[PDB]
Design a protein around this ligand. Structure first.
Ligand code: SF4
Ligand code: SF4
Ligand code: SF4
Ligand code: SF4
Ligand code: FES
Ligand SMILES: [K+]
Ligand SMILES: [Zn+2]
Lengths: 688, 231, 89, 82, 125, 114, 106, 94, 48, 206
């Protein structure tokens, strides 16, 4: 059609016009050497490692930037190409420091490896080397700038991806230095990604420093649970210990980035851990006991209560396996008070229809939107990788973005309509000028943050926002298959709990206080003993001792997300599973096994004894929960809107203020990140 | 790995000077001894054709008159630049194989004499820092040298994909390796051909119609080390 | 000389610098020479104008230019350290 | 008594056509009649449509809805609700 | 003279693997993700098969990492997804297959760095 | 599905070879107990033989049965010719290995293995 | 000569060891220096091949001249960093001389 | 800088010491805890900072090829010393 | 050493020690690393 | 060049011509013939051709491969026929070597080559012992290297390096006993493969 023919070493290839010589070589399966080029950044063409010979042409060309022409034969292994690589590698190493033994990149260094494969095997540089002073840019990223090869990946990433223009080059010639010039910290929710994209040891993880080498680490491909994006990760382990967290490429979720909480909070898994079951001694103090005794104590209380007298609350890091098991157990004593700490209005359709509480456009669908309206959300801190995707569309597609709420910094310019929730009434009625933008839009997208739904008037807001999406789809602006309404969650376990029939929020517990309460990783402090009968019997199951454990009667040590194979559903409804990287510490156990064991002792044995069986049970309640890496799609937005209009609830005057306004509120949000000494250094740095 | 320390060659010369007399004293005890001959002559006779079909090599072939020595027929390293004679037996028994080994010792001294006189100067490992590690002084001064030292001692050098069967004239017979490379820095498969594996498989054949004490002599004449037989 | 700035009592972000009214009128003419939407093109002439008023470029002078043209301060630091006619001392 | 109803169906398959028509026509009326009853509708591609009912103490019953019609689906729920 | 067997190839009984390391193990069949520290893609060509991670504890004497899982280090390489699945089936191993992730083709334009009216214009090189 | 056979051309042929192996193993147990001076009873030894044959009863592939019989005959020869020592014959009984918990609760208490 | 340890926890010796006889852990020292917290050599796994001292870029680990160190228990042959550092302090007078006599062949 | 904990056990340069309730200290009963007493962190801090008259200085640890790989150290900062990452010697521009 | 004495270092042992195996001065191995996982310590007050 | 292994063009032509010669004479079994860049000739044959091909190479006047140097197996689990049987033969008359390869799976027997080369007797016992490949019509096929009663075939790629059981002496039963393997220090798996291609000449197609 519009494809053109080129040759790579004589093999014909059909490429789209504009394809670069480097991209043509990928199709035949050749990787051209590179340093400055990165496929997710702008082309720079400065390292010159990609120089390649085009047949008959006397000058080598930079394959990463040169558009390939018709009939070109790219000679990727000719002597002219090989000598160009040897020459560039010679210049890269001329001033590079002899640091490999003390350098943390050693073993997974592109300079080392491309020197081995494409460079010469010796030196003829007989002078002294350049040495530069180091730059301090925060507690996360260590700089040894003598190792920098001036590829400018960090500068391009900081400016384009993170939307931060704080890194540049100062000076000229051989004395050109990368940095901030002034004493500044590069503290961004995405900052830790410059460690990955720096090809050399110039930028390195400060927490990870000196602890491991890459050849000795075992890699476990898993899922992040620090937010509801479900970023794909790799957990590096060595001899039973978690060493670091790396991004895992997924084009439709996180691409090859992760947030700084995902990257660095893992050190909280080594602190404040629950390693033994505990019960209260006669003096009212928690004391270690056996699995025998702790489960028997709970099973005895469980067998004596029924119906509303037993309730449970699920925290933000709970796996779907544990969720359904606890629902099944309480359903055998006739309790339906299965609650979450995160609120979602149950008015109208509630959780009957999945589309009512999903990111129906999907994360990838942001790149196709032409207008985005954000309501009551700081997506920069609630969903860092979802916010990075918006900026990608803002930068490349010219996306128009408007916000209702606090005028927070999103890393890109946007139209601020204000913070009063009555703007939503104006937009839907047609008086606000922005409604003209929405109507003209051909693929508009409306995102309402789950944080805004935590207000008392959350139901009114969801009705007001859902109404705006009703207006657009009645006009011709949209093609039908395109979905406009979206909810942006911030809690890893929220979507799975809603899918399973949990009641969002703890309103039911407040309405019928229980005599026995299960706190399943619940550390939001939403229910305290001041909300419960004087002798409530509280059971806490979790992996950290934080807010829930101190007030419990029985403590059951569970596993963290790195210590189990567990299912988590992200904000768009995609179901993904973690894998065991290391086993739980001490006497801690897999969370669904604790409930399965407790049920047997209580005489209400659940009908599943393996992870495969409890996942077959998950399929019974919601078949999408076992379709791993699949986004299913939910319809009946029309029906949800009709149900949402039955009850008319008014909007409070309070302006929409997101929970996280500045970066200091981003670092500590769950029990793991609250236990991280790395996260406390970040909080201290951005304040002091 | 390293070059000869200064003064080593003179000491090797001193040892080689007196060694033939030591072989002579050994022969004085055994070669013409009627008891030694009674224990070895016509013991464990193997025909030339049976030796080949049973997979024998080394002295087990040459004791039966087969004119084969991998150092002559398929030379490796510099064996084609040294002069020596291959001892050949005529009766295929333990005594002829014993004489072959004693004569091979004399020829080894003859070859060592030429190596001491013909030792050339120069480097000791291939000047190719992507295979052989650079000198420690280079590793501590040159960026390329340090990188190659680091990679050679962690990942190791990658071997192009392929499979070879390579064999030498080991003192016990043909010692070979069937080495399979998959393109990485670790071998995919490494079969070891031990000359004693086939030789011990022939013990049943070679011992037919002999006394219980002739089995002692027959395992002796094959020179079996169960490190190579068992791997 | 160096290409990293360290605050000192003579040279810090609170060192007083501001364009005189006459130089603001000149700044307006400089900025008018370039297409609307590309005001970053005025960085070189306006840094020079700051140096002609002041003699040299304190870090506060660099920050003022970045503020007038709405360019990130780093992008003005890169220019100031690249071209040799700017005196940073 | 009854505690929960779950309806499974495919978004595209003809076997789920009748259930899709029920939700698009009757679900809103059903939810208004039973505002305190979780009627979890969960779509998933390629699933055989089913109707799950949860009664007291975890008892469950499932009725196939394959190749049903909208009125046949209405009766099946009527049996559960009754 | 050939014979006919209509059955499913199974060799669980003639491999000598203990029963618990057949029935209780979960095999993962996947193409390894690119190590995001490096740009090389040569480690994402072949399919792998690994097993579920099991307990590692600290040796009382030295503090070394102990294990009782004989398959803790077993990694097999396969040319295709179907070669890996076939091998898992005949060995009786329950398995999960993960579809290969391929980087989406990109549109790289050096000229876009200097756009007249688009946000793709870079502020620095 | 046309494959080269080992010995048996169908399951009925294979079942014959299986029964001959059982007879040979059944008759050798009393001698095995005596030659190796085992401290198990002849009935215990024969029960183990039945146990080993029993756990292969589901096989329907004649080639797999032939290999199972081939392996079983080799084991019989090692025992008949006294190549096995006393230690080898007693490894079928795992006398020093404490019983392994089988139910869910027992396995939950001890560790993480399923 | 200052008394600072030569080893910088590069783990090249651990990588090359044909017997997997070396176990190393490291972290930033209180002065920020890159140093080991664990350095074990299982002397009953070791093959005394010298590959570790060839791989070491700073001459930190060496095989000394002592060969008369047989023990009465297995556990005494599991060396940790304290034992190996004491061996260095014990034998340095002779190790340095041996290195001086052979480093030009390396 | 060897020191003893309350139980009387010496603390190693790595900070190791068995706590009070740890049974594993029974291995030292009737024997001794091997502890090297030349702490490297303390010995390297006794070395005097070297005064040089250049922005960049090189260190090979001494001994030429018997030291460590040769590295170059930038001395532009006047608020701290330049330290060698291999041997810990310190340098200051004069 | 009377003719070519060894280089003096202040960390070198002044007193040589022979083989100490089988004595109360024998080497006893132990792990030189610190504890990896810090457990949660419950409060000492019975607020519950 | 001093560091580069020199090429021998005459032996490459010679071994190529002999490879076609064998292919022309044994078309019923020969599936592939190739000569490596270091001049080793490999004949890949259908497994039914083991005895006819090996007999021809031993007895034919222009072959005379009288000595079986080695017989081994290679396990490639990704292949349907995972086991590759490799015969390395030596011709003293023509001072040449040849490699003959075939294949089989777990359940398919290969014909014993003992009739052609008595040397093969123990090699096939080792292949049976260590890979579990059955050889039909073998005079005495049994384990040769492993312990009596050993279960499994250790040289298979999916057999764990340290096995499944380990031995110790137990005082209670006064004999050596076998128990499930536990390691005080687990073997440390290393990922050494660089993510950059080393040898373009061997690149597989995309
Ligand atoms: S960046 Fe790479 S080449 Fe440079 S010192 Fe570190 S490991 Fe060596
Ligand atoms: S610090 Fe790293 S990413 Fe930034 S320019 Fe230097 S080498 Fe490139
Ligand atoms: S000498 Fe011992 S410790 Fe050193 S590399 Fe060889 S086996 Fe490992
Ligand atoms: S002893 Fe040498 S090779 Fe081993 S970690 Fe220390 S510095 Fe590296
Ligand atoms: S990759 Fe093309 S010049 Fe850097
Ligand atoms: K890096
Ligand atoms: Zn130094």
């Amino acid at each position: 059609s519009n494809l053109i023919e080129v040759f790579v070493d004589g093999q014909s290839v059909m490429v789209e016009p504009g394809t670069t010589v480097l991209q043509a070589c990928e199709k035949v399966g050749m990787q051209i050497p590179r340093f400055c080029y990165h496929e997710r950044l702008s082309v720079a063409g400065n390292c010159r490692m990609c120089l390649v010979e085009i047949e008959k042409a006397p000058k080598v060309v930079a394959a990463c930037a040169m558009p390939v022409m018709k009939g070109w034969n790219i000679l990727t292994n000719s002597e002219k190409t090989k000598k160009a690589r040897e020459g560039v590698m010679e210049f890269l190493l001329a001033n590079h420091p002899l640091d490999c033994p003390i350098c943390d990149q050693g073993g997974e260094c592109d300079l080392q490896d491309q020197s081995m494969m494409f460079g010469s095997d010796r030196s003829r540089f007989l002078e002294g080397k350049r040495a530069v002073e180091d730059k301090n840019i925060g507690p996360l990223v260590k700089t040894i700038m003598t190792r920098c090869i001036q590829c400018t990946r960090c500068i391009r990433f900081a400016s384009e991806i993170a939307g931060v223009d704080d890194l540049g080059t100062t000076g000229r010639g051989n004395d050109m230095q990368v940095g901030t010039y002034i004493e500044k910290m590069f503290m961004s929710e995405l900052s830790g990604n410059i460690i990955d994209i720096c090809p050399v040891g110039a930028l390195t993880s400060k927490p990870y420093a000196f602890t491991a080498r890459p050849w000795e680490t075992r890699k476990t491909e898993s899922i992040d649970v620090m937010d509801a994006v479900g970023s794909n990760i790799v957990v590096s382990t060595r001899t039973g210990e978690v060493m670091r967290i790396l991004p895992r490429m997924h084009e439709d979720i996180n691409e090859e980035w992760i947030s700084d909480k995902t990257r660095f909070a893992y050190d909280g898994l080594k602190r404040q851990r629950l390693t033994e079951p505990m019960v209260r001694n006669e003096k009212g103090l928690l004391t270690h006991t056996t699995w025998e005794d702790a489960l028997s104590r709970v099973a005895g209380m469980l067998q004596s209560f029924q119906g509303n007298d037993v309730a449970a609350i699920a925290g933000g890091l709970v796996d779907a396996e544990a969720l359904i098991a606890l629902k099944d157990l309480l359903n055998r004593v006739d309790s339906d008070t299965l609650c979450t700490e995160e609120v979602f209005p149950t008015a109208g359709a509630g959780t009957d229809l999945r589309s009512n509480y999903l990111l129906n456009t999907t994360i990838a669908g942001v790149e196709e939107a032409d207008v985005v309206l954000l309501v009551g959300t700081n997506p920069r801190f609630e969903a860092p990788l979802f916010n990075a995707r918006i900026r990608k569309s803002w930068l490349h597609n010219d996306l128009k973005v408007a916000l209702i709420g606090s005028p927070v910094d999103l890393t890109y310019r946007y139209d601020h309509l204000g913070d009063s929730p009555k703007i939503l009434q104006d937009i839907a009625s047609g008086s606000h000028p922005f409604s003209q933008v929405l109507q003209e839009a051909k693929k508009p997208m409306v995102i309402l943050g789950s944080s805004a739904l935590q207000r008392n008037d959350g139901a009114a807001i969801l009705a007001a926002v859902s109404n705006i999406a009703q207006k657009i789809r009645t006009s011709s602006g949209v093609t039908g298959d395109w979905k406009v309404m979206n909810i942006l969650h911030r809690i890893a376990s929220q979507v799975a709990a809603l899918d399973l029939g949990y009641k969002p929020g703890v309103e039911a517990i407040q309405k019928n206080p229980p005599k026995m309460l299960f706190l399943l990783g619940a550390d939001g402090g939403c229910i305290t003993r001041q909300d419960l009968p004087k002798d409530c019997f509280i059971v806490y199951q979790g992996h950290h001792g934080d807010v829930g454990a101190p007030i419990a009667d029985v403590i059951l040590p569970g596993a963290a997300y790195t210590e189990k194979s567990a299912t988590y559903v992200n904000t768009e409804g995609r179901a993904q599973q973690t894998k065991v990287a290391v086993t739980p510490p001490g006497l801690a156990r897999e969370d669904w096994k604790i409930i399965r064991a407790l049920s047997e002792i209580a005489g209400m044995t659940l009908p599943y004894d393996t992870l495969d069986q409890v996942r077959n049970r998950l399929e019974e309640v919601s078949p999408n929960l076992v379709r791993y890496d699949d986004v299913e799609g939910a319809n009946y937005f029309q029906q949800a809107s009709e149900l949402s209009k039955l009850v008319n609830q008014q909007l409070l005057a309070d302006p929409l203020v997101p929970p996280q306004l500045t970066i200091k509120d981003f670092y500590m949000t769950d029990s793991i990140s609250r236990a991280s000494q790395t996260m406390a250094k970040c909080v201290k740095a951005v304040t002091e | 790995h390293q070059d000869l320390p200064l003064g080593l060659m003179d000491d090797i010369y001193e040892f080689s000077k007196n060694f033939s007399l030591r072989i002579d004293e050994l022969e004085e005890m055994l070669t013409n001894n009627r008891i030694w001959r009674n224990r070895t002559v016509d013991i464990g006779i193997v025909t030339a054709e049976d030796a080949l079909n049973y997979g024998f090599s080394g002295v087990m072939l040459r004791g039966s008159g087969i004119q084969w020595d991998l150092r002559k027929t398929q030379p490796y390293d510099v064996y084609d630049q040294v002069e020596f004679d291959v001892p050949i037996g005529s009766r295929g028994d333990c005594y002829d194989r014993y004489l072959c080994r004693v004569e091979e010792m004399r020829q080894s001294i003859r070859i060592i004499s030429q190596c001491l006189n013909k030792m050339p100067p120069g480097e000791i490992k291939v000047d190719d820092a992507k295979v052989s590690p650079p000198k420690r002084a280079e590793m501590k001064t040159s960026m390329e040298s340090l990188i190659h030292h680091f990679k050679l001692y962690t990942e190791g050098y990658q071997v192009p994909p392929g499979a070879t069967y390579t064999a030498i004239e080991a003192p016990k017979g043909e010692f070979g390796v069937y080495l399979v490379s998959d393109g990485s820095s670790r071998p995919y498969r490494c079969k070891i051909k031990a000359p004693g594996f086939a030789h011990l498989a022939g013990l049943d054949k070679m011992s037919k119609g002999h006394m219980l004490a002739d089995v002692v002599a027959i395992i002796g004449t094959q020179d079996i080390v169960f490190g190579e037989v068992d791997r | 000389a160096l290409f990293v700035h360290r605050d000192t009592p003579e040279n810090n972000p609170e060192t007083p610098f501001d364009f005189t009214p006459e130089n603001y009128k000149r700044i307006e003419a400089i900025v008018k020479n370039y297409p609307e939407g590309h005001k970053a093109a005025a960085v070189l002439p306006v840094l020079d104008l700051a140096q002609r008023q002041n003699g040299w470029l304190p870090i506060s002078a660099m920050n003022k230019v970045a503020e007038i043209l709405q360019v990130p301060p780093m992008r003005v630091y890169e220019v100031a350290t690249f071209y040799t006619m700017y005196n940073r001392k | 008594g009854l505690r929960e109803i779950r309806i499974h169906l495919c978004q595209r398959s003809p076997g789920s056509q009748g259930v899709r028509d029920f939700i698009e026509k009757r679900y809103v009326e059903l939810k208004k009649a039973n505002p305190d009853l979780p009627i979890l509708i969960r779509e998933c591609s390629d699933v055989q449509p089913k109707l799950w009912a949860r009664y007291a103490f975890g008892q469950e019953k499932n009725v196939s809805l394959n190749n049903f019609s909208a009125d046949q689906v209405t009766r099946a729920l009527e049996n559960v609700l009754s | 003279q050939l014979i006919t067997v209509d059955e499913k190839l199974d060799i669980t009984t003639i491999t000598g693997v203990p029963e618990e390391h057949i029935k209780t193990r979960k095999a993962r069949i996947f193409v390894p993700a690119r190590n995001n520290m490096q740009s090389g893609v040569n480690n994402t060509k072949k399919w792998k098969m690994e097993f579920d991670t099991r307990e590692r504890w600290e040796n009382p004497l030295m503090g070394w990492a102990s294990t009782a899982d004989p398959l803790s280090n077993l990694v097999l390489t396969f040319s295709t997804k179907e070669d890996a699945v076939a091998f898992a089936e005949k060995n009786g191993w329950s398995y999960d297959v993960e579809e290969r992730k391929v980087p989406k083709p990109k549109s790289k334009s050096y000229g876009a760095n200097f756009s007249w009216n688009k946000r793709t214009r870079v502020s620095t090189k | 599905t046309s494959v080269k056979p080992i010995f048996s051309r169908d399951m009925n042929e294979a079942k014959r070879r299986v029964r001959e192996l059982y007879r040979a193993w059944y008759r050798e147990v009393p001698n095995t107990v005596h030659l190796f001076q085992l401290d198990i009873s002849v009935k215990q030894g024969r029960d183990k033989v039945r146990e080993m044959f029993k756990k292969n009863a589901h096989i329907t592939d004649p080639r797999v049965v032939d290999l199972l019989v081939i392996k079983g005959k080799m084991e019989l020869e090692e025992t008949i010719k006294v190549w096995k020592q006393r230690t080898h014959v007693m490894r079928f009984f795992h006398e020093t290995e404490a019983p392994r918990p089988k139910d869910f609760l027992s396995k939950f208490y001890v560790g993480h293995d399923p | 000569p200052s008394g600072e340890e030569r080893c910088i926890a590069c783990k090249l010796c651990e990588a090359v060891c044909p017997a997997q006889a070396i176990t190393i852990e490291a972290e930033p020292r209180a002065d920020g220096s890159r140093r080991t917290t664990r350095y074990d050599i299982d002397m009953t796994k070791c093959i005394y091949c010298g590959f570790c001292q060839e791989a070491c870029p700073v001459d930190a680990i060496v095989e000394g001249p002592n060969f008369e160190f047989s023990t009465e228990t297995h556990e005494e042959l599991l060396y940790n960093k304290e034992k190996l550092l004491n061996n260095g302090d014990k034998w340095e007078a002779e190790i340095a001389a041996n290195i001086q006599a052979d480093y030009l062949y390396r | 800088g060897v020191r003893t904990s309350p139980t009387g056990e010496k603390v190693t340069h790595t900070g190791q010491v068995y706590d009070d309730g740890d049974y594993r200290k029974v291995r030292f009963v009737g024997r001794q805890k091997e502890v090297n007493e030349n702490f490297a962190i303390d010995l390297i801090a006794e070395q005097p900072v070297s005064q040089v008259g250049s922005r960049v200085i090189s260190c090979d640890g001494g001994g030429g090829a018997l030291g460590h790989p040769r590295v170059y150290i930038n001395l532009d900062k006047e608020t701290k010393t330049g330290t060698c990452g291999y041997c810990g010697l310190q340098f200051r521009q004069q | 050493p009377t003719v070519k004495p060894p280089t003096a270092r202040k960390f070198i042992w002044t007193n040589h020690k022979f083989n100490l195996s089988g004595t109360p001065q024998q080497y006893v191995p132990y792990s030189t690393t610190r504890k990896k996982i810090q457990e949660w310590v419950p409060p000492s007050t019975p607020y519950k | 060049r001093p560091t580069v292994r020199p090429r021998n063009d005459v032996a490459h032509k010679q071994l190529s011509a002999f490879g076609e010669y064998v292919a022309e004479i044994l078309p019923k079994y020969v599936q592939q013939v190739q000569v490596s860049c270091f001049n080793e000739l490999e004949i890949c044959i259908h497994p039914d051709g083991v005895i006819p091909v090996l007999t021809f190479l031993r007895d034919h006047s222009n072959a005379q491969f009288k000595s079986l140097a080695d017989l081994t197996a290679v396990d490639i689990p990704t292949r349907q026929n995972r086991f590759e049987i490799v015969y390395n033969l030596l011709s003293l008359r023509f001072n040449s070597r040849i490699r003959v390869k075939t294949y089989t799976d777990e359940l398919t027997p290969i014909e014993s080559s003992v009739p052609v080369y008595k040397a093969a007797n123990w090699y096939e016992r080792e292949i049976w012992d260590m890979f579990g490949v059955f050889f039909a019509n073998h005079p005495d096929l049994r384990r040769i290297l492993t312990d009596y009663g050993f279960e499994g075939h250790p040289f298979r790629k999916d057999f764990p390096l340290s096995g499944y059981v380990e031995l110790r002496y137990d005082d209670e039963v006064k004999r050596v006993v076998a128990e499930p393997v536990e390691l005080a220090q687990e073997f440390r798996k290393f990922d050494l493969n660089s993510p950059w291609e080393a040898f373009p000449a061997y690149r597989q197609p995309p």
